[PDB]
Amino acid sequence: GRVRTKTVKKAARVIIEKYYTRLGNDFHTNKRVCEEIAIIPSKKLRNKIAGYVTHLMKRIQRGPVRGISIKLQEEERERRDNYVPEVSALDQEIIEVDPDTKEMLKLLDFGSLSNLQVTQPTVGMNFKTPRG
Amino acid sequence: MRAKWRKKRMRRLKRKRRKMRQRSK
Amino acid sequence: KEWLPVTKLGRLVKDMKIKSLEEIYLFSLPIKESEIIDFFLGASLKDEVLKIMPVQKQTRAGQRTRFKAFVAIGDYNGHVGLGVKCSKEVATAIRGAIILAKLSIVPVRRGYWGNKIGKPHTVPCKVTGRCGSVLVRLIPAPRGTGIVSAPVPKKLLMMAGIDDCYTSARGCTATLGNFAKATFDAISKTYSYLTPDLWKETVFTKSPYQEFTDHLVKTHT
Amino acid sequence: KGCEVVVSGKLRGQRAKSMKFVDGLMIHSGDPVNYYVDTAVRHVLLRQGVLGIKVK
Amino acid sequence: SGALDVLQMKEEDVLKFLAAGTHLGGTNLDFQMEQYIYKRKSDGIYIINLKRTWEKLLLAARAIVAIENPADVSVISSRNTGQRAVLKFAAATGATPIAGRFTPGTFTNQIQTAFREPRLLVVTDPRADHQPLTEASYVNLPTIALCNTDSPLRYVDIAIPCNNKGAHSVGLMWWMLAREVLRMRGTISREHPWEVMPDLYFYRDPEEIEKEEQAAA
Amino acid sequence: TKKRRNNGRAKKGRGHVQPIRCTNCARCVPKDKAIKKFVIRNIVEAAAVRDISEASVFDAYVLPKLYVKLHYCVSCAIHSKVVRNRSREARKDRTPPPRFR
Amino acid sequence: MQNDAGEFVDLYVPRKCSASNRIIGAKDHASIQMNVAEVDKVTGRFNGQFKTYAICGAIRRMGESDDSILRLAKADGIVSKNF
Amino acid sequence: GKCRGLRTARKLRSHRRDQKWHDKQYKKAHLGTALKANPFGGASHAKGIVLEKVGVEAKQPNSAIRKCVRV
Amino acid sequence: VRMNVLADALKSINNAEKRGKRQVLIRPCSKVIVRFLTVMMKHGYIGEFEIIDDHRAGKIVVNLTGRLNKCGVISPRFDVQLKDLEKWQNNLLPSRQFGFIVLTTSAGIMDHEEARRKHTGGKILGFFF
RNA sequence: CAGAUACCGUCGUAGUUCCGACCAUAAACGAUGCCGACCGGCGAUGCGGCGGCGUUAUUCCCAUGACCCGCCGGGCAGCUUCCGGGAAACCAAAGUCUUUGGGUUCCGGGGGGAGUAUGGUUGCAAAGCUGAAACUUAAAGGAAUUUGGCGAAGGGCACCACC
RNA sequence: AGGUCUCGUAGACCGUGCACCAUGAGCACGAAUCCU
Ligand SMILES: [Zn+2]
């Protein structure tokens, strides 16, 4: 069939990793870019490389690719990972607590807290799946 | 040959030998 | 012919801020560069080839043969080692075995027989090595007795610096690999024996890493 | 980038044997074997026969 | 590690622990975790004593601050829960992070490019990360583990009993370890509140990311 | 050498069990050793069910099923492709094979 | 290690484990040497001293080293006595 | 040793006596049948008279005619 | 059934010493076990041992320390003399620097060194080093 | 089928079934004697006992049966393990064994001849128990890994294979 | 008052043993270390 080899996939991965603002979706334009910027000693290898670059960018403008890393999808992840909320999501106005751990906290270092309320336990104990 | 039928053969040979000795009185 | 140390222990050794390999043995640090020992132990480190046993693996056409070389190394007043390497021809097998023998040398301590006068000469206790079926036992001997054994543990014991010993082997000792590794296990288990000679509670000194980490961060990454 | 030396003939014995010594890079197929490697086959007139040399 | 009167939880830490849910553990119990259990409540959930967790966290903080080079501490995580938390820990305390695919041979093979030589190791789960523990055992290298009530306690030296199944509990334990290390180092004042944002250690699945991006700008 | 933890059976505290017969063969095989297959089959398999259902007296008639338990000798079970040989590590797995529907 | 003259003759004194009092060998790579930092009494910072514990490889291979370290820290006075 | 008691000596002695009798090399030298069946009669050398010169053959691997004599 | 209580006591001590334990529990007590442990503890191999007293047979809990290599018995109680002791310490002990044979003596339960400079011997009990 | 007194199919005698009298043999095998102590964890299972929220034998109480959660003791077994052992397969005993000794019975010294000959003994008989030697041989064996072939299995390929 | 309530239709386990198939005398195998 038509399965690419190590040299085509590796060369395509490094030319997308090193260049993104010059390469595009049209096969002839990035084919001529791969002529100019990369040293390819043949033509079939050049065409296979340019075709895999076209397919890889058709993947990239849809979603992320785990094999390579380019600057535009870089630091959008760090913007996503460096967010802050308004409320800290831990200093809520009421915290539910079980009677057993409430009695544990009564003997630990405190007698009563200002932000806890005792709930009611279950009427029965059935907590494992039927296995035997 | 396997041990079972060899033991059967040697039983038959021993029976024939015992018969010949008891008829050689 | 130039040393480029990959580990930080090799850089600490090469920059000449450690004293001996005794602190390395005290802290039980792994040694993965063979010629750190060649830096420490100089012309006193001699090797003799024990056995070259050829092995075969049968294939599509014929049997592909390979040579496994045993060598023992060590200075005659201390440390002793043993290394095994199997490769295609003989010379690179011997070279790799010498490298693995220099890589793994163990220290020895020597005791006395009755009266503790002068330098030690014999094994301090009744140590025992075990690998495969070969069971090698080393017993202390009086002064001037000499190493009485099979020739392979005899030459290993003169290489290890032990002068007087009583041995008693058991099992299929014709296999030289099991025999040599069993007597090497018997010799190497000598410090791993608690006697009332050293019952005092030890003092913990600083590791070389935490005391020369300023040199490490100033020199390399 | 590579070399391969093989010595063929009889070597310390009646039965002949071949000892191949190779390290580095060595290609065999295609057109790039023609204009990269150089191969010479010579002979040695030993006292017990003729010895073969193939270097590349 | 709590023998004084300045190294204990006052009010906020217990509330954070109760909010994240670090007191409740797994259904199963290991035999080496009978120490760090108060009592089994209903529905087969074990309750972790918080004072023992605080003492073990203080001991691990002492172990981290005990060495002076911050780069020699290596922090490993492989699961998707503690991904951002270990990176924020290495950003705060100067450690070296390995987040995602701890490849084998990094502690034993000196030809591989990721050959690190650390002095102290901190992991997230001994059950999931059984691979850094064996490579830690192959050299002389102690480790720190945030252990649950059912993790196999083996080859570890400071086991901090907590909840490693929820993202909030993992992120909270990482944040308290970071602030304890920074307080013992002296770079962070003790009386002033350093509770700026504990949410930076909290992972969220990408459907929540799209929901947050649709709700906010 | 010993091949299995048990001896290819499930006799642990008996010494003697009742022997049964194979289905295809007539070989006397012990009960805890023979491979059993309790198959639940229907009378009409996949295309005749609509043939019965359209041409019937009673509407909404449920089709009855056939129940049978099969006893297989080991050679007959391997020959009839019931069980196969497994690797040395996969021999110790006692779970039933997975089912899709 | 001594003789009739009383001089020292051994190559090195080996480290003993702080948990089982067993000899740590020169080829036992699973053995560790843990350093524990102390704290200031009032201000609560790193004063500079070290506290050292050594655990042999058999204890870590058993997997029961944290109990030993906690016991040694309770004996030294690091961990609070009530715990 | 199995029977390990303080006044157990005749049991050990009798057991080792029967197990020593249950051997091959020791039993060959302590029975008169092996000595009587031996044509030398327990002697190192012996004399005899030649009857005829025979020729016997070797075994499977090597082939020769090993020449002997009937005495 | 149970035939030698000192043998089982020393085997329990040896097993818990090999396992790395800190305390043991010998189930039956006797005078010879107490004297044997007294010989070890005076010679500096174990700690203080507590005798849990009850009305049937006491239990002994010794504070084990990382100081012992092996403890064993020699069954049956072979009688030795002064001329037979050298062979026993030759084939039983690791070196001639440490290690002791405890033997039953008319002067009491006592090791081989004071059996040597008290000029008396008897039946053997066991060894430890 | 070359032969088929074998595999296969149709008949079928002693036997298979019960009573009464006999022989004491099996891969009668966990191919692992019996008693006693110690040395890891886990979830289940059968029996007996103890404790506890709850559901049910229809709505309240008690004991009981049936479930749920734990604990104790004995038993058939299971999963994992750098405890430890072994030549290895493997074994929580086949561990606590050159750092060699808890008590005790039976039993083996390379393979074949050979469970043979003779003697004794047991049985109506078939046969059981005890049990050699002459002679002959340098091997016969146990555990595991790659090419070996399967009229072994699971996936693919070839007009020098087929349709 | 509205008129086929909704989401996709592996909607493959009809078949079980399967005829005859024996034999290859072997000559023919070597067992490895250091470089000025
Ligand atoms: Zn059948």
Side-chain angles (χ1 to χ4, degrees), chain A, chain B, chain C, chain D, chain E residues 1-112 114-217, chain F, chain G, chain H, chain I:
Chain A
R2 298 184 192 274
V3 180
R4 272 85 71 191
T5 316
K6 291 268 207 304
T7 181
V8 181
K9 300 210 168 192
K10 276 157 168 267
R13 278 161 202 256
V14 298
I15 179 154
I16 307 188
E17 183 216 330
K18 287 196 184 290
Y19 296 104
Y20 206 54
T21 187
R22 305 148 80 111
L23 301 153
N25 193 0
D26 172 81
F27 163 70
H28 308 279
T29 301
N30 46 38
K31 158 174 73 177
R32 287 322 218 275
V33 165
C34 291
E35 211 156 10
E36 156 192 337
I37 194 66
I39 301 299
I40 304 308
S42 287
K43 213 158 65 173
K44 294 174 179 61
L45 196 84
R46 196 274 315 267
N47 293 347
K48 286 168 178 294
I49 279 166
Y52 194 43
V53 173
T54 298
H55 189 49
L56 265 170
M57 292 180 183
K58 212 200 297 294
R59 285 178 60 190
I60 296 169
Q61 323 274 110
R62 274 191 61 131
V65 176
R66 67 175 293 265
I68 61 171
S69 172
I70 193 66
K71 204 193 61 73
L72 284 179
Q73 53 164 0
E74 173 37 69
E75 52 76 21
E76 190 276 331
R77 55 152 187 117
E78 192 66 89
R79 195 260 290 173
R80 208 151 42 180
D81 212 3
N82 271 21
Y83 76 106
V84 297
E86 291 76 341
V87 177
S88 169
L90 286 179
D91 284 87
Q92 64 187 304
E93 41 175 40
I94 181 60
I95 296 91
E96 271 305 334
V97 66
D98 291 331
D100 284 26
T101 177
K102 174 102 191 63
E103 211 76 20
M104 181 265 268
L105 286 159
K106 190 179 299 298
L107 61 83
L108 188 151
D109 281 285
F110 317 99
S112 292
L113 277 296
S114 304
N115 217 338
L116 318 175
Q117 49 166 341
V118 178
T119 180
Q120 277 70 32
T122 64
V123 67
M125 40 185 78
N126 45 1
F127 57 95
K128 54 192 63 149
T129 187
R131 294 273 179 84
Chain B
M1 47 193 316
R2 87 189 216 179
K4 200 178 179 189
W5 316 137
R6 177 209 319 272
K7 160 158 158 53
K8 185 169 188 62
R9 216 171 63 152
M10 185 179 288
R11 214 93 62 81
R12 194 180 301 162
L13 188 153
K14 191 193 306 179
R15 193 197 314 200
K16 187 161 90 132
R17 214 151 60 190
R18 180 181 66 192
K19 184 253 292 177
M20 204 47 256
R21 190 164 168 197
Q22 285 183 1
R23 292 284 90 82
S24 289
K25 295 296 181 180
Chain C
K1 201 65 173 59
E2 188 39 66
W3 186 2
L4 272 301
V6 298
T7 177
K8 57 180 68 180
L9 182 55
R11 293 180 181 177
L12 194 146
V13 162
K14 194 197 176 188
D15 187 74
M16 182 145 38
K17 293 181 176 67
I18 205 163
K19 284 215 151 52
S20 52
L21 76 164
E22 302 306 84
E23 311 86 327
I24 307 179
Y25 283 9
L26 182 135
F27 284 102
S28 81
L29 298 183
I31 313 173
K32 289 184 180 296
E33 303 195 11
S34 65
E35 60 86 20
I36 299 181
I37 297 89
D38 198 2
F39 165 100
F40 274 110
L41 304 177
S44 81
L45 183 63
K46 293 152 199 89
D47 46 49
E48 311 206 80
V49 191
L50 297 190
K51 198 189 194 30
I52 305 184
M53 181 180 74
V55 299
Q56 285 174 27
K57 167 190 174 295
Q58 200 163 1
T59 44
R60 179 66 65 192
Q63 317 106 333
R64 175 210 81 199
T65 186
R66 272 148 45 106
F67 296 92
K68 175 197 297 181
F70 295 87
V71 70
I73 205 163
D75 48 338
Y76 283 62
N77 63 47
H79 319 90
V80 63
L82 176 85
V84 188
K85 184 52 158 304
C86 169
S87 67
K88 215 154 290 184
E89 54 264 3
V90 177
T92 175
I94 283 177
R95 184 81 70 55
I98 284 172
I99 284 302
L100 265 70
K102 275 198 309 305
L103 206 45
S104 163
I105 46 160
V106 290
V108 298
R109 63 180 292 166
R110 293 151 286 174
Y112 295 93
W113 189 82
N115 264 347
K116 302 196 281 185
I117 305 181
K119 299 298 178 291
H121 60 280
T122 188
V123 190
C125 295
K126 273 180 193 180
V127 288
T128 300
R130 273 271 311 111
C131 72
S133 78
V134 179
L135 162 63
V136 170
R137 188 192 197 187
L138 300 196
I139 290 152
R143 202 186 288 275
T145 295
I147 303 108
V148 64
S149 69
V152 181
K154 167 192 290 298
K155 61 182 49 60
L156 194 53
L157 279 181
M158 327 195 298
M159 183 165 327
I162 297 175
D163 291 331
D164 291 331
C165 174
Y166 278 132
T167 75
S168 187
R170 179 148 179 277
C172 184
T173 57
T175 76
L176 194 144
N178 266 325
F179 195 36
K181 267 189 287 156
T183 180
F184 182 70
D185 189 359
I187 300 164
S188 66
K189 250 156 83 171
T190 302
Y191 282 102
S192 296
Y193 204 110
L194 189 44
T195 69
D197 186 74
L198 72 165
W199 272 357
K200 59 187 293 294
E201 173 37 70
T202 180
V203 288
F204 299 126
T205 187
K206 297 182 170 48
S207 171
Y209 283 41
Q210 65 183 357
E211 201 56 14
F212 303 77
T213 179
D214 186 74
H215 184 272
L216 315 182
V217 68
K218 271 165 29 183
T219 44
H220 68 84
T221 312
Chain D
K1 292 205 298 293
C3 182
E4 169 161 349
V5 179
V6 63
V7 181
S8 47
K10 44 173 77 165
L11 290 91
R12 55 186 289 267
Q14 303 333 319
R15 190 82 150 262
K17 63 197 76 63
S18 52
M19 318 188 315
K20 172 196 288 172
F21 307 99
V22 65
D23 60 327
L25 284 87
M26 261 315 317
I27 58 180
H28 303 89
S29 73
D31 184 348
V33 65
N34 312 139
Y35 48 84
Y36 272 13
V37 302
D38 313 318
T39 309
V41 191
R42 317 301 308 234
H43 306 325
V44 175
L45 277 296
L46 285 182
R47 70 171 323 277
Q48 303 303 40
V50 58
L51 210 64
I53 302 175
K54 280 192 292 148
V55 299
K56 54 181 51 177
Chain E
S1 50
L4 307 186
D5 291 331
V6 71
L7 301 175
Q8 280 106 350
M9 303 164 317
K10 275 82 63 179
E11 164 80 14
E12 295 286 327
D13 303 338
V14 176
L15 266 297
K16 286 177 185 294
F17 279 141
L18 285 157
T22 79
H23 53 263
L24 58 93
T27 300
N28 290 318
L29 176 58
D30 209 338
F31 82 109
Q32 286 163 289
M33 291 295 198
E34 198 188 1
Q35 214 165 9
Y36 314 99
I37 300 298
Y38 163 70
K39 189 174 72 68
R40 185 169 205 160
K41 60 169 190 84
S42 291
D43 303 301
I45 299 298
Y46 282 114
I47 307 300
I48 302 176
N49 194 5
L50 277 297
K51 192 174 176 69
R52 321 211 171 214
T53 293
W54 191 248
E55 284 284 333
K56 287 311 277 292
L57 197 51
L58 264 289
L59 201 58
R62 286 165 173 258
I64 292 172
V65 177
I67 77 183
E68 72 173 1
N69 203 327
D72 291 331
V73 178
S74 299
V75 181
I76 321 292
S77 194
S78 78
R79 310 171 34 84
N80 291 45
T81 294
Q83 273 323 290
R84 57 182 313 209
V86 297
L87 297 169
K88 290 327 200 166
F89 188 87
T93 81
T96 312
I98 301 188
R101 183 60 184 170
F102 181 81
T103 175
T106 49
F107 297 150
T108 50
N109 207 335
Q110 62 265 4
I111 297 89
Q112 308 186 11
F115 176 52
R116 301 169 150 89
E117 269 171 327
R119 292 179 59 191
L120 195 60
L121 185 56
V122 189
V123 301
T124 56
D125 205 299
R127 168 75 56 75
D129 291 331
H130 49 57
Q131 194 63 37
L133 296 181
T134 66
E135 287 176 73
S137 159
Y138 278 133
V139 296
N140 313 91
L141 188 153
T143 187
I144 318 294
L146 293 147
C147 295
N148 217 332
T149 57
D150 62 358
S151 64
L153 198 148
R154 188 205 203 168
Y155 285 105
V156 299
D157 313 288
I158 308 294
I160 321 177
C162 64
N163 194 5
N164 46 28
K165 304 182 31 193
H168 283 276
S169 55
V170 164
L172 177 66
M173 294 299 291
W174 277 115
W175 171 76
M176 310 206 98
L177 189 42
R179 66 186 293 274
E180 279 323 291
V181 166
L182 283 177
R183 277 180 172 176
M184 301 215 178
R185 204 101 51 81
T187 63
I188 293 307
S189 50
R190 201 159 266 278
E191 297 93 34
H192 302 176
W194 197 73
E195 293 84 3
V196 293
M197 271 315 327
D199 183 278
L200 268 72
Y201 298 84
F202 290 167
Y203 168 98
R204 39 207 194 90
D205 62 358
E207 46 197 300
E208 271 199 288
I209 297 170
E210 281 146 300
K211 202 168 72 70
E212 192 264 340
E213 285 192 4
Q214 285 291 327
Chain F
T1 177
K2 184 172 276 293
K3 201 174 185 176
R4 306 169 165 95
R5 179 80 176 91
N6 53 324
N7 295 332
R9 55 195 305 164
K11 186 200 68 53
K12 313 298 285 181
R14 274 141 290 280
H16 184 252
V17 290
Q18 289 173 344
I20 67 182
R21 315 296 295 268
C22 179
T23 45
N24 290 318
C25 308
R27 183 174 184 84
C28 295
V29 56
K31 181 169 170 294
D32 69 315
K33 195 186 187 180
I35 294 165
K36 301 174 185 67
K37 210 189 60 185
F38 186 87
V39 54
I40 297 89
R41 264 191 191 211
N42 62 6
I43 298 284
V44 293
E45 291 155 350
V49 57
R50 198 164 93 121
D51 211 329
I52 301 299
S53 286
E54 295 264 40
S56 60
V57 168
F58 317 105
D59 62 357
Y61 184 54
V62 58
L63 277 296
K65 321 189 80 63
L66 182 63
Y67 304 75
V68 58
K69 199 176 182 190
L70 300 175
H71 308 287
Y72 274 141
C73 47
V74 181
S75 47
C76 301
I78 295 171
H79 193 31
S80 294
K81 299 298 293 295
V82 176
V83 290
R84 294 194 259 94
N85 59 83
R86 289 198 303 201
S87 66
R88 264 181 51 151
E89 61 77 10
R91 254 201 280 280
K92 312 170 56 184
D93 193 0
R94 315 190 79 256
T95 179
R99 42 202 276 193
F100 181 73
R101 49 188 153 83
Chain G
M1 66 182 179
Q2 295 183 351
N3 45 2
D4 51 347
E7 71 156 50
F8 302 85
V9 73
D10 280 15
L11 282 72
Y12 64 94
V13 285
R15 276 177 320 170
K16 295 186 293 188
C17 178
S18 296
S20 45
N21 205 358
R22 203 185 295 176
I23 301 284
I24 294 177
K27 290 306 168 185
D28 195 25
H29 297 102
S31 296
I32 62 170
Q33 197 193 290
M34 192 85 158
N35 296 115
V36 173
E38 313 92 351
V39 75
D40 203 326
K41 300 294 187 291
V42 176
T43 61
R45 278 165 152 97
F46 176 74
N47 50 72
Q49 313 174 310
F50 287 162
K51 272 303 162 55
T52 309
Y53 304 118
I55 302 296
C56 65
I59 300 297
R60 290 196 70 214
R61 210 167 329 267
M62 174 177 327
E64 184 178 1
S65 56
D66 63 347
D67 197 5
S68 299
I69 290 191
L70 191 63
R71 276 197 303 113
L72 294 174
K74 279 224 270 205
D76 273 11
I78 307 299
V79 176
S80 66
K81 324 321 301 173
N82 63 6
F83 180 53
Chain H
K2 192 63 66 184
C3 182
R4 194 191 325 268
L6 194 48
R7 53 201 283 174
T8 69
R10 73 174 75 256
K11 168 72 176 182
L12 290 184
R13 222 181 61 229
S14 301
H15 172 254
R16 184 70 60 241
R17 195 186 295 128
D18 318 302
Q19 294 304 314
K20 189 175 301 183
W21 206 240
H22 204 147
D23 209 345
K24 161 161 270 170
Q25 313 153 240
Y26 164 100
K27 200 178 173 69
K28 201 160 62 50
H30 288 61
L31 283 190
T33 63
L35 271 299
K36 284 156 198 152
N38 181 221
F40 271 14
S44 170
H45 295 252
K47 278 195 192 311
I49 313 187
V50 159
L51 270 77
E52 63 185 2
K53 296 187 282 290
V54 297
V56 302
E57 291 206 58
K59 284 195 301 179
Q60 159 73 239
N62 54 3
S63 66
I65 301 175
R66 314 293 174 177
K67 295 177 174 65
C68 305
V69 62
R70 277 269 283 192
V71 177
Chain I
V1 292
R2 196 175 209 102
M3 322 275 267
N4 189 359
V5 293
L6 172 63
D8 187 29
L10 291 193
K11 285 297 286 293
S12 301
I13 289 171
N14 189 359
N15 287 347
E17 183 56 59
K18 258 147 53 173
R19 272 302 274 159
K21 312 283 265 160
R22 292 296 292 276
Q23 264 155 19
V24 307
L25 179 71
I26 297 104
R27 191 184 90 195
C29 82
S30 66
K31 294 165 292 174
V32 294
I33 288 169
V34 170
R35 288 284 188 277
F36 202 93
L37 291 158
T38 301
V39 167
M40 261 177 268
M41 172 205 158
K42 185 54 72 54
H43 273 287
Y45 282 74
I46 45 179
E48 321 191 298
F49 59 99
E50 193 80 31
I51 300 171
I52 296 171
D53 206 335
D54 62 358
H55 287 155
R56 274 151 300 280
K59 308 174 183 180
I60 307 146
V61 178
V62 65
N63 189 359
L64 268 191
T65 175
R67 210 82 82 68
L68 194 62
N69 289 113
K70 206 193 173 296
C71 283
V73 288
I74 298 179
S75 173
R77 268 174 193 91
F78 285 145
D79 62 357
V80 308
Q81 316 182 358
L82 277 186
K83 66 164 206 62
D84 291 331
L85 199 55
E86 182 36 79
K87 307 163 190 306
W88 277 105
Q89 49 206 150
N90 189 359
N91 64 7
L92 208 75
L93 276 298
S95 68
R96 295 179 67 250
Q97 311 283 316
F98 59 93
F100 296 125
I101 282 172
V102 184
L103 73 164
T104 317
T105 303
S106 173
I109 307 301
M110 65 181 288
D111 46 308
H112 71 271
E113 266 165 5
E114 39 186 352
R116 274 211 161 280
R117 74 280 191 190
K118 281 215 72 73
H119 197 80
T120 187
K123 319 199 151 196
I124 200 169
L125 275 182
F127 64 101
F128 68 101
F129 43 86

